[PDB]
Amino acid sequence: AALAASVRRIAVADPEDPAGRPLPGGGASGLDRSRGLTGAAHMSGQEAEELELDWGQVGRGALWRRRPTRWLLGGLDGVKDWELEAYAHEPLANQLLGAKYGGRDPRAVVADPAYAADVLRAGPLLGMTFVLRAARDLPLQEVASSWRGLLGNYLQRQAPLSLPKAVRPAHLDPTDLNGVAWPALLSRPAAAAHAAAEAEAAGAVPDDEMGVAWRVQSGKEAAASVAAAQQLLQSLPDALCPGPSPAAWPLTGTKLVDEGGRNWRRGGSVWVTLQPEGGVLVQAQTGGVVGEQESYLLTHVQGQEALAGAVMSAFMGPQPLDPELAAAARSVLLVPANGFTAANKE
Amino acid sequence: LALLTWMSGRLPTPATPEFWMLAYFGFYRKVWPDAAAWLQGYVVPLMGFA
Amino acid sequence: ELMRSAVPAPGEVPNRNSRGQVAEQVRAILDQY
Amino acid sequence: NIFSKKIISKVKQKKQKLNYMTSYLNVQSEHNVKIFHNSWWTHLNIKNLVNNQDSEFIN
Amino acid sequence: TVAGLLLTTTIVVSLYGLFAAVFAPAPALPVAVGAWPGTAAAAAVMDGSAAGLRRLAAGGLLLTAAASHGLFDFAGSVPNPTIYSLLNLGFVAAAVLQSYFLYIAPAWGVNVNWDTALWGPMYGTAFLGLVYGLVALTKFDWSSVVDAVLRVACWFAELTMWFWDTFVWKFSWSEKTRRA
Amino acid sequence: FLGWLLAPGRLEFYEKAACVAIALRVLGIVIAIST
Amino acid sequence: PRLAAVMPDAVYALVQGTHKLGEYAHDLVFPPTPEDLRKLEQQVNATIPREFDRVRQRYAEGKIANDEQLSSELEDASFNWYRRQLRTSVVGATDEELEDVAVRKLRLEPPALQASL
Amino acid sequence: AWQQSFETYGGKLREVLLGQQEAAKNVAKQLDEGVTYMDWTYRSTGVDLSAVWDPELWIRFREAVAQNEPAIFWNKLLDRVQYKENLPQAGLVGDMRISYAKFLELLKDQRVKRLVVYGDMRTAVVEVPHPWSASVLGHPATHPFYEDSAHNRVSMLRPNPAAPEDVTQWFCAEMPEWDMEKYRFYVD
Numbered sequence A: 001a002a003l004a005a006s007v008r009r010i011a012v013a014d015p016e017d018p019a020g021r022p023l024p025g026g027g028a029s030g031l032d033r034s035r036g037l038t039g040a041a042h043m044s045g046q047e048a049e050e051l052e053l054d055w056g057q058v059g060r061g062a063l064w065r066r067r068p069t070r071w072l073l074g075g076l077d078g079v080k081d082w083e084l085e086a087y088a089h090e091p092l093a094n095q096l097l098g099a100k101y102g103g104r105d106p107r108a109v110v111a112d113p114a115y116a117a118d119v120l121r122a123g124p125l126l127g128m129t130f131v132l133r134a135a136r137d138l139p140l141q142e143v144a145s146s147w148r149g150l151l152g153n154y155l156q157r158q159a160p161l162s163l164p165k166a167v168r169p170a171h172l173d174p175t176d177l178n179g180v181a182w183p184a185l186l187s188r189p190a191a192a193a194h195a196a197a198e199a200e201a202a203g204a205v206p207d208d209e210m211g212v213a214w215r216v217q218s219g220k221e222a223a224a225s226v227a228a229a230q231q232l233l234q235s236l237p238d239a240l241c242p243g244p245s246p247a248a249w250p251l252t253g254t255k256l257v258d259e260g261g262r263n264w265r266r267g268g269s270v271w272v273t274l275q276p277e278g279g280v281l282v283q284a285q286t287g288g289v290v291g292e293q294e295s296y297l298l299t300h301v302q303g304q305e306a307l308a309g310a311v312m313s314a315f316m317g318p319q320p321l322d323p324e325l326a327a328a329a330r331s332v333l334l335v336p337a338n339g340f341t342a343a344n345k346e
Numbered sequence B: 001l002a003l004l005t006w007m008s009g010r011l012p013t014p015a016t017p018e019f020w021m022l023a024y025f026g027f028y029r030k031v032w033p034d035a036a037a038w039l040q041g042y043v044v045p046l047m048g049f050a
Numbered sequence C: 001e002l003m004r005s006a007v008p009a010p011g012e013v014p015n016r017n018s019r020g021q022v023a024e025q026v027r028a029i030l031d032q033y
Numbered sequence D: 001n002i003f004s005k006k007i008i009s010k011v012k013q014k015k016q017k018l019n020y021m022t023s024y025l026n027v028q029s030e031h032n033v034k035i036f037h038n039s040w041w042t043h044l045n046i047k048n049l050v051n052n053q054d055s056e057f058i059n
Numbered sequence E: 001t002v003a004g005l006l007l008t009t010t011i012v013v014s015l016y017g018l019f020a021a022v023f024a025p026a027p028a029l030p031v032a033v034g035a036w037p038g039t040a041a042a043a044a045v046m047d048g049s050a051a052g053l054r055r056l057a058a059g060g061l062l063l064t065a066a067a068s069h070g071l072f073d074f075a076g077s078v079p080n081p082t083i084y085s086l087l088n089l090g091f092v093a094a095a096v097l098q099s100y101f102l103y104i105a106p107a108w109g110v111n112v113n114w115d116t117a118l119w120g121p122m123y124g125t126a127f128l129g130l131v132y133g134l135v136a137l138t139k140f141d142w143s144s145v146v147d148a149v150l151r152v153a154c155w156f157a158e159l160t161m162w163f164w165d166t167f168v169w170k171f172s173w174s175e176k177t178r179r180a
Numbered sequence F: 001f002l003g004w005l006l007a008p009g010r011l012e013f014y015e016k017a018a019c020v021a022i023a024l025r026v027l028g029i030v031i032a033i034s035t
Numbered sequence G: 001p002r003l004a005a006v007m008p009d010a011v012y013a014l015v016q017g018t019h020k021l022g023e024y025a026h027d028l029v030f031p032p033t034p035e036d037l038r039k040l041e042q043q044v045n046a047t048i049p050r051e052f053d054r055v056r057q058r059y060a061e062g063k064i065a066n067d068e069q070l071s072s073e074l075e076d077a078s079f080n081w082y083r084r085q086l087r088t089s090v091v092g093a094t095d096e097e098l099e100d101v102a103v104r105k106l107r108l109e110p111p112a113l114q115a116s117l
Numbered sequence H: 001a002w003q004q005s006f007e008t009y010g011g012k013l014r015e016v017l018l019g020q021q022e023a024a025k026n027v028a029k030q031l032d033e034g035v036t037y038m039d040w041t042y043r044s045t046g047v048d049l050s051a052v053w054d055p056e057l058w059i060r061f062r063e064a065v066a067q068n069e070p071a072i073f074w075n076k077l078l079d080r081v082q083y084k085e086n087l088p089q090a091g092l093v094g095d096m097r098i099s100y101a102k103f104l105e106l107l108k109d110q111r112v113k114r115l116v117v118y119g120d121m122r123t124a125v126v127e128v129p130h131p132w133s134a135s136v137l138g139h140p141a142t143h144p145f146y147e148d149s150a151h152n153r154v155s156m157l158r159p160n161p162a163a164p165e166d167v168t169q170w171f172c173a174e175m176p177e178w179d180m181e182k183y184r185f186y187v188d
């Protein structure tokens, strides 16, 4: 661990016995060349591709306490709450949406609302990520009440969810605890189309071109899940602010918030991801010197389809927090469906 | 201005050539090509035309 | 002994005195009393 | 708090003497102004001896 | 005085707002490509419910323009020097109230930065009305701001004289002495 | 500049001048209170 | 008189006075701790050598001095600590022979890294 | 009266500072970094003060006011004013020049302990240990710094299993620099 914490790279003697001359291995390792930096890690392209960072940036937007005015002096009136970015899985974005809406006029594909409901309901399937960072000083009570009022209306005004059908069980193989079957799933007989078809014969036949058999849940399971979601949000002033003592608050004792226990630091980042089956992943990261950045995993709830739908149709829904990033992200989710990738790593 | 009044023994007013030489050279060719951008980016938005 | 610095410390350098300084020392101790 | 001040002043002067005396291990001395035959070599104009007597590419 | 400059600048700005508002049919709102291709009024045209709104704004701007021209060329002697004290109310208070509306405009979330011929003269004439409230509030003599100029010039002169005599060359050295 | 300004010879001159200065100041005030 | 002696005293007085004024600036804005003064009490106590603890107990039980007998008591404590440190320099410490002195002043051994963690 | 103002403003300033405590410790770093390297003065005033300003003296003054040891300051400042006294006078005796080829040769074969390149970068003082004070051989010409219990100086030879029979190709540790006797040669 002490070796790993420092940087010292040590050449390796050749297993060839004659002289033990160190080999030209060396290595620049653009992930190593990037410490000491502040914002991100320049990566020289292909290196990030071989690292499986399969979430290309899709849209940048800003949550403003008050958007800036051109007319008053210099736009100093502009006060921004957060600076948010979004990302989405590009291989899968090519796989599902590229087989149905690909091959047409891009304008014609985005122009009809079928594609809109597509990008709305198939969002959580892609494992879409939202990375929003702190742009100023933030007390937790303030932004917490803000978030409650923000996700209340999206909790109230939404219909039953539209979910696919689980074709394969995907049991785990405990004795093999790092093996995943999707290579076998695509290369079972080298003709996996027919076996996959006779496999979905049991569950259901897809409703459209890409291969999803939609099932919008009926009357019930549409309020019980929403009631459980409202409950999970009801735990925000309690989980964020348990009791009157910050000494026992979960935020104190680490650099994501100040040592005073009541302000959140600028450069703090929140990552949100949405699994297919209503699962939520949420992480945090205090920014700054890349050499000492601290990542944090907050919680992993499952089954909460209501909050997943709320997040996706709040960021990208009919009435999003800022329609500009919604439009930009939908168009830039169209652009890789032709095959390519934004931030062109080929 | 301070040094000119101390040396010549009188303040340069718009009635004198010293004031106009100072104005033109100093002001117009040293501070104006930048204070112009400052006012074009800070005070003109307040009024009607952007 | 692999992760030692080879740059000793600002501290573990003991003093070494020039000729003028040994003369200063010899005077200040011969007439200490 | 006087006793600590006195005993620590004693060991401070003692450590100073340890440093100025022999191989002590962590202490920083203080230097003095030198008022004597200071540098002894600016007292001299020796250019005529060294250049063996006994600026045109510029302009 | 700055009263004349105030009112004549409100004249120019309001008449230019009119000349740019009554001569063009309408601007166009950005389409924001890919913004909810169904509902939410995106990727549409501006409505016949706002052109008349723009013309009404322009007509009010013209009426207050002619009002400012009247007050300016009337009180240029600053016949009635004191009657306008009534319309003084009307000329200023509402103006400030105007700004209040626009000061709550970012709160309502209405966008004023994208379009040119609507909120530009809005904020301009509103702030200019508050500034006329200032011109009547502190009564700039047109020679008092010049006095502030002279005050800061005298202060900086006393700073540079000290800087010279302390760090550049002593005033006792530079100046000639007499009697011998 | 300072190494030339605070040379030992200039130091001794400064010291002697200041000594005579303080001497004459206190002697003048002695003869002035003696009036 | 003797500027060569005045200048070092001048700079010493300057920096020490600045340190005092900074201490005052820190004790009024941030008032002093009520009980961690005992933390610093004991942690400046712990580094007092053993040869002084003999008067520390003599400082507790009444018979310290009038004011002068201690100021000639702790003198010989200072001096025996002085000669003890001299012997530790030359002939080494109590549990250390000449081979270990040559080891220590040749800087032959590294600081124990396995025992560190 | 000044103490009356201190006791009055102290309680007010303490609470105001403890209020934020987040910018009041980054305003500290900005102010200290700006006062250390006076690199803000050109666009602020027009006088580029960074060319006559000395960061190391300021950092030493800060440390000597924070740890109350004036030597850390004085000891530095004194060698600025008295720089002509610190030219080497010990290992240089007469016409102690070497030639550029002799210096290059000594450099290539690792006999130079310390190279001191001067201000103009066109003059150097080579430092070369006495041959017996270079390694830790127990030669009876080095002062007995390191000795055994039985008072025999220590030596650190290793017989070079690849090239034996020639003592000059053996391996041995080097001696601490503060224990070498050194010639200080001059070179243009």
Ligand SMILES: CC[C@H](CC[C@@H](C)[C@H]1CC[C@H]2[C@@H]3CC=C4C[C@@H](O)CC[C@]4(C)[C@H]3CC[C@]12C)C(C)C
Residues within 6 Å of the ligand: A132, A147, A150, A151, A232, A233, A235, A236, A239, A272, A280, A282, A299, A301, A307, A311, A314
């Ligand atoms: C409109 C909000 C928007 C971003 C989305 C965030 C605030 C939402 C997405 C997932 C949610 C959590 C899911 C499970 C947990 C754990 C539970 O203990 C209490 C409720 C809580 C925090 C949930 C509530 C907060 C979370 C993070 C912002 C950008 C406006």
